[PDB]
Amino acid sequence: IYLNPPIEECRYKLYQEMFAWKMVVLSLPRIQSQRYQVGVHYELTEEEKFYRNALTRMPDGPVALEESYSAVMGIVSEVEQYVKVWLQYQCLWDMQA
Amino acid sequence: SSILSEVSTRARSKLPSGKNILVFGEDGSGKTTLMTKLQGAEHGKKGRGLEYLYLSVHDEDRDDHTRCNVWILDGDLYHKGLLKFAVSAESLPETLVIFVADMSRPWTVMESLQKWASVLREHIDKMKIPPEKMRELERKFVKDFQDYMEPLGDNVLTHNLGIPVLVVCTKCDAVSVLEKEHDYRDEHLDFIQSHLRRFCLQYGAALIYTSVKEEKNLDLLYKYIVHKTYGFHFTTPALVVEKDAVFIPAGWDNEKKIAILHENFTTVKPEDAYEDFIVKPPVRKLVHDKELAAEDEQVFLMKQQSLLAKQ
C-alpha cells in the first residue's frame, strides 16, 4: 500500500494554501512618506516595505492562529488515522493462516 | 476487538518514522534557505509562524524512503503559543532541535541562545511531562553522550532536556566579510568559539559551521542529522582542525578541549560578559524629525494678554 503523495503532503499543501491566504492580505506594500522624504536614504527593509507586521495586530490575539493550526492538525490526524486503517489491510498479502 | 491483535502482530521489516525535528530561531536568519537547501530545493517560501517541511530521507544501503518532519518556526515571541502544536508528548521522545546562528550578526547569537533557554524549557514544563519518563529520557541521552567514540564534569549537561540537541551557525561565508569590514579580530572568533562550545557542553549539543553560499558541510549536516534521528552509520571525525568550518560531535567536546581554545587568545579573559567582548553594531537609521507642534489658541492668547499687560 503506497501513498502516491506522502501523508506529509496532506499538511504541506494545506500550509501552502493558508500561507497564500495570508499573503493575499499581508504582502501588501506599506504606505510610506518616502515618496518625497528622501532623507531616509536606505533600501526599504522587507519587514517595513512589505507590511509584515499585521500578525501582531490581531484584534482577537493569536487565538486565530491557534484555532487555524488546531483545525489543520485535527484534519490531518483524522485523515492519517483513516489512511492507517487502510494500511491495516497490508496483511492480506503477508500472513500465515 | 480481536482483529487489531492478529493483524497488528503480523509485523514486517520497516524503518522508524514519525520523527519530529524542530527548528526555531531569530527571524531573517536565512533559516528557511538552510532547511530548504538541506531538503534539496534551492529555497522554498518564507512566512509567519510555524511552517511544514518534510525531509525525505532515503537509506541507499537498505533502499527505503522515509520522511522526517522539519517544522521551522518564526522568531516572533508573540508567536510562542503555537509551539504547543509543534511538540507533543507522543512526538517528544523523537524530538531534535537545531539552532540557526546567523553569523552575519554574531552580536545577536548568545542572547538568542538564552531566548531559547527560556522558551524551550517553559514549553517543555508547561506540557506536564511525568517525572519518570523525563528522567529516563534524560539519563538515556546522558549515557548516549557518555559513550562517544570516534564524559563527566561539573557543568556537562548540567541543564538540558534529555533529547538530541543540535546547533548550527550559518552565513559562514560572511565571517571574512565582517573580518575585513568590521576589523573583527580572530581572537574574537576564538572567544565566540569557546563560548558556543561551553554552551553546547552544558547542554549536550553539537555545532557545525555551514554556509549555503559556500555549500559547506551540508552533506555533513545531512549525515549527522540522519545518524542522530535514526541511528545510521557515522564515520566523519571531529572536524575542529580549521576554524573556517568546525564540526563538534556530541561527546567530543571536553573542558580541556575548550581550555586549549582559550589558550590561543589572550586579549581579554573569556570570563568576561559576552556582549562586552564583541563590539555592538551601531544603529544606522536616524530618528524621525521632531514634531513641529503649533501653539494652540488658549496659551498663545493668554501669553498675548500678559504681553499687553506688561505694556
Short mmCIF file of C-alpha atoms in Angstrom, two decimals:
data_model
loop_
_atom_site.label_atom_id
_atom_site.label_comp_id
_atom_site.label_asym_id
_atom_site.label_seq_id
_atom_site.Cartn_x
_atom_site.Cartn_y
_atom_site.Cartn_z
CA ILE A 1 0.00 0.00 0.00
CA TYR A 2 1.65 3.20 -1.24
CA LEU A 3 0.62 6.82 -0.81
CA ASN A 4 1.42 8.42 -4.16
CA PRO A 5 1.58 11.71 -2.27
CA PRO A 6 3.10 11.06 1.16
CA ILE A 7 0.83 11.80 4.11
CA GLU A 8 3.10 14.77 4.85
CA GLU A 9 1.77 16.32 1.64
CA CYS A 10 -1.70 16.50 3.20
CA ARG A 11 -0.37 19.07 5.68
CA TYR A 12 2.27 20.66 3.43
CA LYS A 13 -0.14 21.62 0.65
CA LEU A 14 -2.66 22.92 3.18
CA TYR A 15 0.07 25.01 4.80
CA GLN A 16 0.87 26.40 1.36
CA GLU A 17 -2.81 27.25 0.89
CA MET A 18 -3.06 29.03 4.24
CA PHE A 19 0.20 30.87 3.55
CA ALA A 20 -1.28 32.06 0.26
CA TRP A 21 -4.43 33.15 2.11
CA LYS A 22 -2.15 35.05 4.49
CA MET A 23 -0.02 36.67 1.77
CA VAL A 24 -3.06 37.83 -0.22
CA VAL A 25 -3.66 40.33 2.61
CA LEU A 26 -0.14 40.52 4.13
CA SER A 27 2.08 41.04 1.06
CA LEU A 28 0.53 44.47 0.57
CA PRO A 29 3.21 47.19 0.40
CA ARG A 30 3.18 49.58 3.34
CA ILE A 31 2.03 53.17 2.91
CA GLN A 32 5.03 55.42 3.46
CA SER A 33 6.14 59.04 3.16
CA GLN A 34 9.39 58.02 1.43
CA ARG A 35 7.99 59.10 -1.97
CA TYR A 36 9.39 62.59 -1.35
CA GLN A 37 11.00 62.10 2.09
CA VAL A 38 14.31 61.02 0.55
CA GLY A 39 16.18 61.87 3.76
CA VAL A 40 15.93 58.18 4.70
CA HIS A 41 18.49 57.19 2.07
CA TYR A 42 18.44 53.43 2.57
CA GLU A 43 16.94 50.46 0.76
CA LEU A 44 13.50 49.83 2.22
CA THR A 45 13.61 46.89 4.62
CA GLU A 46 11.39 43.95 3.76
CA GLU A 47 9.57 43.86 7.11
CA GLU A 48 8.51 47.50 6.71
CA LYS A 49 8.32 47.87 2.92
CA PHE A 50 6.00 44.86 2.54
CA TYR A 51 3.90 45.50 5.68
CA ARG A 52 4.73 42.28 7.52
CA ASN A 53 3.61 43.39 11.00
CA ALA A 54 -0.11 42.65 10.67
CA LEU A 55 0.02 39.36 12.60
CA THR A 56 0.98 41.22 15.77
CA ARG A 57 -2.16 43.34 15.22
CA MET A 58 -4.78 40.63 15.74
CA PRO A 59 -7.91 42.12 17.36
CA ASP A 60 -8.64 38.68 18.83
CA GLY A 61 -4.98 37.98 19.57
CA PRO A 62 -3.04 34.96 18.32
CA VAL A 63 -6.05 32.73 19.09
CA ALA A 64 -6.96 32.89 15.40
CA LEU A 65 -3.62 31.28 14.53
CA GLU A 66 -4.05 28.75 17.34
CA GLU A 67 -7.54 27.90 16.06
CA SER A 68 -6.24 27.58 12.50
CA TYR A 69 -3.38 25.25 13.38
CA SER A 70 -5.61 23.20 15.69
CA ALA A 71 -8.08 22.70 12.85
CA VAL A 72 -5.24 21.86 10.47
CA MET A 73 -3.69 19.11 12.53
CA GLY A 74 -7.09 17.81 13.57
CA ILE A 75 -7.98 17.25 9.92
CA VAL A 76 -4.54 15.82 9.19
CA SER A 77 -4.61 13.48 12.19
CA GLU A 78 -8.08 12.14 11.44
CA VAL A 79 -7.26 11.57 7.77
CA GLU A 80 -3.95 9.94 8.75
CA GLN A 81 -5.86 7.63 11.09
CA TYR A 82 -8.29 6.80 8.29
CA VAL A 83 -5.37 6.00 5.97
CA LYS A 84 -3.72 3.94 8.71
CA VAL A 85 -6.95 1.94 8.82
CA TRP A 86 -6.38 1.20 5.13
CA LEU A 87 -2.76 0.25 5.86
CA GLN A 88 -4.13 -2.42 8.20
CA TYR A 89 -5.15 -4.26 5.00
CA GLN A 90 -1.45 -4.86 4.22
CA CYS A 91 -1.69 -8.24 5.98
CA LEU A 92 -3.75 -9.55 3.04
CA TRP A 93 -0.51 -10.31 1.17
CA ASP A 94 1.77 -11.31 4.06
CA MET A 95 0.10 -13.63 6.55
CA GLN A 96 0.48 -17.18 7.78
CA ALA A 97 -3.03 -18.57 8.19
CA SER B 1 -11.56 -6.40 19.15
CA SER B 2 -9.63 -9.48 18.05
CA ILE B 3 -8.60 -8.17 14.61
CA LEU B 4 -6.36 -5.37 15.90
CA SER B 5 -4.34 -8.05 17.70
CA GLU B 6 -3.96 -10.66 14.96
CA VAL B 7 -3.32 -8.24 12.10
CA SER B 8 -1.07 -5.98 14.19
CA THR B 9 1.10 -8.87 15.41
CA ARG B 10 1.91 -9.62 11.74
CA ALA B 11 4.69 -7.03 11.56
CA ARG B 12 7.42 -6.95 8.91
CA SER B 13 10.71 -5.12 8.44
CA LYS B 14 10.46 -1.33 8.46
CA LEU B 15 12.30 1.84 9.46
CA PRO B 16 11.22 4.09 12.36
CA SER B 17 9.27 7.16 11.27
CA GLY B 18 7.26 9.97 12.80
CA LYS B 19 10.42 11.78 13.90
CA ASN B 20 9.95 15.43 14.82
CA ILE B 21 13.00 17.64 14.30
CA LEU B 22 12.18 21.23 15.24
CA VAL B 23 13.89 24.50 14.35
CA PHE B 24 13.17 27.89 15.88
CA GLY B 25 15.43 30.94 15.81
CA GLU B 26 15.77 34.60 15.03
CA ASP B 27 13.71 35.68 12.04
CA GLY B 28 15.53 36.67 8.87
CA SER B 29 18.49 34.41 9.68
CA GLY B 30 18.20 32.52 6.40
CA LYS B 31 16.77 29.55 8.28
CA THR B 32 14.22 28.83 5.55
CA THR B 33 17.02 28.82 2.98
CA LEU B 34 19.08 26.48 5.18
CA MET B 35 16.46 23.79 5.66
CA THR B 36 15.09 24.07 2.12
CA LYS B 37 18.62 23.62 0.74
CA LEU B 38 19.09 20.63 3.05
CA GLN B 39 15.78 19.30 1.73
CA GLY B 40 17.11 19.68 -1.82
CA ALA B 41 15.23 22.68 -3.17
CA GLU B 42 17.22 25.89 -3.53
CA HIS B 43 14.68 27.78 -1.39
CA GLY B 44 11.00 27.45 -0.58
CA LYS B 45 8.87 30.35 0.64
CA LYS B 46 9.17 32.25 3.91
CA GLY B 47 6.25 33.44 6.02
CA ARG B 48 4.97 33.82 9.56
CA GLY B 49 4.65 31.30 12.35
CA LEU B 50 5.17 27.58 12.06
CA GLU B 51 5.91 26.09 8.63
CA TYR B 52 5.99 22.47 7.45
CA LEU B 53 8.95 20.88 5.69
CA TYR B 54 9.08 17.13 5.16
CA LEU B 55 12.64 15.79 4.97
CA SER B 56 12.69 12.86 2.56
CA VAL B 57 15.42 10.56 3.88
CA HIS B 58 16.50 7.60 1.75
CA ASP B 59 18.83 4.86 3.01
CA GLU B 60 20.62 3.60 -0.10
CA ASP B 61 22.09 0.75 1.96
CA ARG B 62 18.58 -0.57 2.72
CA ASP B 63 16.84 1.05 -0.30
CA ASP B 64 13.90 2.60 1.55
CA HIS B 65 12.27 6.02 1.70
CA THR B 66 11.39 7.91 4.88
CA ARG B 67 10.26 11.49 5.51
CA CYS B 68 11.08 13.45 8.66
CA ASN B 69 9.11 16.46 9.88
CA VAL B 70 11.10 19.69 9.68
CA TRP B 71 8.97 22.40 11.28
CA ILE B 72 10.73 25.75 11.06
CA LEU B 73 9.27 28.35 13.42
CA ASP B 74 9.27 32.14 13.21
CA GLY B 75 11.32 34.16 15.68
CA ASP B 76 8.46 36.31 16.94
CA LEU B 77 7.92 35.90 20.67
CA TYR B 78 4.30 36.89 20.03
CA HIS B 79 4.00 33.62 18.08
CA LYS B 80 5.08 31.47 21.04
CA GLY B 81 1.73 29.90 21.92
CA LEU B 82 1.72 27.77 18.77
CA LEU B 83 4.75 25.75 19.92
CA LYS B 84 2.22 23.52 21.68
CA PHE B 85 1.17 22.48 18.19
CA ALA B 86 4.78 21.69 17.25
CA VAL B 87 5.75 19.41 20.15
CA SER B 88 3.58 16.79 21.84
CA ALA B 89 4.26 14.08 24.40
CA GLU B 90 3.81 11.35 21.78
CA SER B 91 6.31 13.04 19.46
CA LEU B 92 8.52 14.10 22.39
CA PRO B 93 10.92 11.09 22.50
CA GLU B 94 11.88 11.67 18.84
CA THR B 95 12.43 15.44 19.03
CA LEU B 96 15.69 17.06 17.90
CA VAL B 97 16.33 20.81 17.84
CA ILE B 98 18.70 22.89 15.71
CA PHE B 99 19.95 26.44 16.24
CA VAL B 100 20.14 28.87 13.33
CA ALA B 101 23.07 31.13 14.23
CA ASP B 102 23.27 33.84 11.57
CA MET B 103 26.97 34.62 11.98
CA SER B 104 26.47 37.74 9.86
CA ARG B 105 25.16 39.12 13.19
CA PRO B 106 27.23 37.48 15.94
CA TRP B 107 26.05 40.16 18.36
CA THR B 108 22.55 38.64 18.50
CA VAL B 109 23.64 35.00 18.78
CA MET B 110 24.11 34.48 22.51
CA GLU B 111 21.03 36.36 23.69
CA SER B 112 19.01 34.35 21.17
CA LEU B 113 20.59 31.30 22.80
CA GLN B 114 19.21 32.44 26.17
CA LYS B 115 15.93 33.30 24.44
CA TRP B 116 15.65 29.62 23.63
CA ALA B 117 16.88 28.82 27.12
CA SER B 118 13.68 30.45 28.33
CA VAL B 119 11.25 29.43 25.58
CA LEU B 120 12.09 25.77 25.03
CA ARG B 121 12.05 24.77 28.69
CA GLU B 122 8.99 26.84 29.54
CA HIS B 123 7.29 24.90 26.75
CA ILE B 124 8.64 21.57 27.99
CA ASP B 125 7.49 22.17 31.57
CA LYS B 126 4.12 23.68 30.64
CA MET B 127 3.16 20.40 28.94
CA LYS B 128 3.43 18.50 32.26
CA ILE B 129 5.61 15.52 31.37
CA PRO B 130 5.54 12.81 34.06
CA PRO B 131 8.82 12.87 36.01
CA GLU B 132 9.57 9.19 35.35
CA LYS B 133 9.64 9.47 31.55
CA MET B 134 11.52 12.78 31.69
CA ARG B 135 14.15 11.27 33.98
CA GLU B 136 14.51 8.11 31.90
CA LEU B 137 14.93 10.01 28.63
CA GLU B 138 17.36 12.40 30.34
CA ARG B 139 19.56 9.55 31.57
CA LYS B 140 19.31 7.83 28.18
CA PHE B 141 20.56 11.00 26.49
CA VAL B 142 23.27 11.33 29.15
CA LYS B 143 24.56 7.81 28.56
CA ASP B 144 24.39 8.31 24.78
CA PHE B 145 26.53 11.41 25.26
CA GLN B 146 28.91 9.46 27.50
CA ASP B 147 29.55 6.63 25.02
CA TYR B 148 31.07 8.82 22.30
CA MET B 149 33.94 7.18 20.41
CA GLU B 150 35.41 8.17 17.04
CA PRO B 151 32.32 12.01 29.75
CA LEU B 152 31.79 13.53 33.20
CA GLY B 153 32.18 17.01 34.62
CA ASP B 154 30.71 19.70 36.82
CA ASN B 155 28.77 21.53 34.09
CA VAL B 156 28.39 18.80 31.45
CA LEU B 157 24.66 18.54 30.69
CA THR B 158 24.11 20.44 33.95
CA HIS B 159 20.76 21.53 32.50
CA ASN B 160 19.10 20.02 29.42
CA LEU B 161 16.01 18.21 28.15
CA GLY B 162 17.47 14.74 27.56
CA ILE B 163 16.81 14.86 23.81
CA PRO B 164 19.33 15.10 20.95
CA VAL B 165 20.19 18.78 20.63
CA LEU B 166 21.88 20.31 17.60
CA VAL B 167 23.07 23.82 16.85
CA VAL B 168 24.39 25.12 13.52
CA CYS B 169 25.76 28.51 12.50
CA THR B 170 25.08 29.88 9.02
CA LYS B 171 26.48 32.71 6.90
CA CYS B 172 29.98 31.29 7.32
CA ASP B 173 30.94 32.93 4.02
CA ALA B 174 30.34 36.34 5.62
CA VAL B 175 32.74 35.82 8.55
CA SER B 176 35.51 37.07 6.26
CA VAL B 177 33.27 39.97 5.22
CA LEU B 178 32.96 41.04 8.85
CA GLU B 179 36.62 40.07 9.31
CA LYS B 180 37.66 42.86 6.94
CA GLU B 181 34.82 45.39 7.18
CA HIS B 182 34.49 45.32 10.99
CA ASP B 183 38.16 44.53 11.75
CA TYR B 184 36.69 41.58 13.65
CA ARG B 185 39.69 40.02 15.35
CA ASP B 186 40.38 36.30 15.03
CA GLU B 187 40.71 36.34 18.82
CA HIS B 188 37.05 37.36 18.84
CA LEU B 189 36.32 34.30 16.70
CA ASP B 190 38.24 32.14 19.17
CA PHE B 191 36.32 33.62 22.11
CA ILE B 192 32.93 33.06 20.50
CA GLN B 193 34.01 29.51 19.59
CA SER B 194 34.92 28.87 23.22
CA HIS B 195 31.61 30.33 24.41
CA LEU B 196 29.49 28.29 21.99
CA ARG B 197 31.46 25.18 22.94
CA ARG B 198 30.73 25.87 26.61
CA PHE B 199 27.02 26.26 25.89
CA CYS B 200 26.89 23.09 23.80
CA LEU B 201 28.77 21.18 26.51
CA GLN B 202 26.43 22.30 29.28
CA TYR B 203 23.51 21.18 27.07
CA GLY B 204 24.99 18.18 25.25
CA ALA B 205 24.72 19.98 21.91
CA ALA B 206 26.73 19.62 18.70
CA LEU B 207 27.74 22.56 16.49
CA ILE B 208 28.61 22.60 12.79
CA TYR B 209 29.69 25.59 10.73
CA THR B 210 27.83 25.93 7.46
CA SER B 211 27.23 28.32 4.58
CA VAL B 212 24.75 27.79 1.74
CA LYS B 213 26.75 30.31 -0.29
CA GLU B 214 29.83 28.11 0.20
CA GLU B 215 27.72 24.90 0.20
CA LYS B 216 29.77 23.95 3.25
CA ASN B 217 29.16 20.90 5.49
CA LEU B 218 25.66 20.43 4.04
CA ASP B 219 26.39 16.77 3.33
CA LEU B 220 27.90 16.54 6.81
CA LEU B 221 24.76 18.13 8.27
CA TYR B 222 22.56 15.61 6.46
CA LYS B 223 24.74 12.70 7.56
CA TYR B 224 24.76 13.81 11.20
CA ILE B 225 21.03 14.51 11.40
CA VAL B 226 20.12 11.17 9.80
CA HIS B 227 22.61 9.35 12.05
CA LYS B 228 21.09 11.04 15.09
CA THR B 229 17.36 10.74 14.36
CA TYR B 230 17.61 7.17 13.05
CA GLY B 231 20.86 5.62 14.25
CA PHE B 232 22.58 5.38 10.88
CA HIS B 233 26.28 4.69 10.49
CA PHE B 234 28.52 7.69 11.12
CA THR B 235 32.21 7.96 10.28
CA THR B 236 33.09 11.66 9.95
CA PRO B 237 35.70 12.58 12.59
CA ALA B 238 35.68 15.69 14.80
CA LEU B 239 36.33 18.42 12.24
CA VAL B 240 37.96 21.01 14.51
CA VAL B 241 41.28 21.39 12.70
CA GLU B 242 40.33 24.60 10.86
CA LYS B 243 38.32 27.49 12.29
CA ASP B 244 36.56 28.15 8.97
CA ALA B 245 34.38 25.03 9.39
CA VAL B 246 34.26 23.31 12.77
CA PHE B 247 32.26 20.14 13.49
CA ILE B 248 31.88 19.09 17.13
CA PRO B 249 30.39 15.60 17.60
CA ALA B 250 28.09 15.08 20.57
CA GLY B 251 30.53 13.85 23.22
CA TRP B 252 33.68 15.15 21.53
CA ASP B 253 33.63 18.42 23.47
CA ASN B 254 35.68 18.45 26.67
CA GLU B 255 36.52 21.16 29.18
CA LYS B 256 40.22 20.95 28.35
CA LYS B 257 39.27 20.99 24.67
CA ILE B 258 37.88 24.44 25.48
CA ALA B 259 40.87 25.41 27.65
CA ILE B 260 43.18 24.78 24.70
CA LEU B 261 40.97 27.11 22.65
CA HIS B 262 41.18 29.63 25.49
CA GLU B 263 44.97 29.46 25.39
CA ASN B 264 45.36 30.80 21.84
CA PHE B 265 43.71 34.18 22.53
CA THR B 266 45.00 36.42 25.31
CA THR B 267 43.40 39.81 24.58
CA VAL B 268 40.60 39.70 27.17
CA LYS B 269 39.84 36.85 29.55
CA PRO B 270 36.97 34.62 28.33
CA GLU B 271 35.25 35.01 31.71
CA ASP B 272 34.03 38.47 30.65
CA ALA B 273 30.45 39.09 29.55
CA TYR B 274 29.57 38.05 26.01
CA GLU B 275 28.36 41.45 24.82
CA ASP B 276 31.34 43.20 26.43
CA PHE B 277 33.88 41.36 24.28
CA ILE B 278 32.07 41.75 20.94
CA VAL B 279 31.60 45.24 19.50
CA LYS B 280 27.98 46.37 19.35
CA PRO B 281 26.76 47.25 15.84
CA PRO B 282 25.64 50.89 15.98
CA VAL B 283 22.19 51.81 14.71
CA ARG B 284 22.32 53.48 11.29
CA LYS B 285 18.81 54.87 10.81
CA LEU B 286 18.27 58.41 12.07
CA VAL B 287 15.42 59.33 14.39
CA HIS B 288 12.46 60.87 12.58
CA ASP B 289 12.17 64.65 12.62
CA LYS B 290 10.66 66.01 15.82
CA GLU B 291 7.03 67.08 15.77
CA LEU B 292 6.62 70.73 14.74
CA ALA B 293 3.65 71.32 17.01
CA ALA B 294 1.82 74.64 16.74
CA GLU B 295 0.96 76.63 19.84
CA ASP B 296 -2.77 76.40 20.42
CA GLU B 297 -5.07 79.40 20.73
CA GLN B 298 -5.53 79.35 24.51
CA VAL B 299 -1.97 79.64 25.81
CA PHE B 300 -0.99 81.92 22.92
CA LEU B 301 -3.90 84.24 23.71
CA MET B 302 -3.10 84.35 27.42
CA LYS B 303 0.56 85.00 26.58
CA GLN B 304 -0.55 87.91 24.40
CA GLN B 305 -2.70 89.15 27.29
CA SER B 306 0.39 89.08 29.50
CA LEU B 307 2.36 90.91 26.80
CA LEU B 308 -0.27 93.65 26.54
CA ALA B 309 -0.48 93.89 30.34
CA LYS B 310 3.29 94.44 30.51
CA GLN B 311 2.77 97.36 28.11
#
